[PDB]
Amino acid sequence: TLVKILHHLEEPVIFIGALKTEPQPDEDVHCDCLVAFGHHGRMLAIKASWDESGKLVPELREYCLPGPVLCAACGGGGRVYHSTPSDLCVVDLS
């Protein structure tokens, strides 16, 4: 010199990242998925489908994982390491 709305999780966002789902060293991996986290423990995931109607369609999940999520990171091969005040847990999307 415009801003676009995607989803609105009901709770505060904590971590936004990207994964390599279906992984079938190089620092730039062509990332397949998109991940968001809530505080209250709503996880969101998105992927490309291209199935049934012969068109790319956006595939949304929303998981509700336990406990008030305090942090997270992503690790090699579609893995996300996240933390509740009880325990440190993981999710595998591969």
């Binding site: 009901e10 423990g41 509700c64 994982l65 336990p66 440190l88």
Partner: protein
């Protein structure tokens, strides 16, 4: 109280008396009070499933409480 193993979780160390020897940390007892226990599986088999049962049902509980508040509104 600390993690002496390097497992992640804290453990309790208990030292028995100086009548045994005139030496420090002889006659010890390290314990998690779960599985880890050092000194001088139908039980340990179906437990994580049961834990995860609590977690699933705790999520449903809290979800429905959110749901209830929505209906009031």
């Amino acid at each position: 109280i600390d993690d002496f193993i390097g497992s992640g979780t804290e453990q309790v160390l208990l030292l028995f008396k100086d009548s045994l020897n005139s030496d420090c940390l002889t006659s010890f007892k390290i314990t998690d009070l779960g599985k880890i226990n050092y000194s001088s599986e139908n039980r340990y088999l179906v437990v994580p499933p049961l834990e995860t049962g609590l977690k699933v049902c705790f999520s449903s509980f809290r979800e429905l409480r959110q749901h209830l508040l929505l209906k009031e509104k």
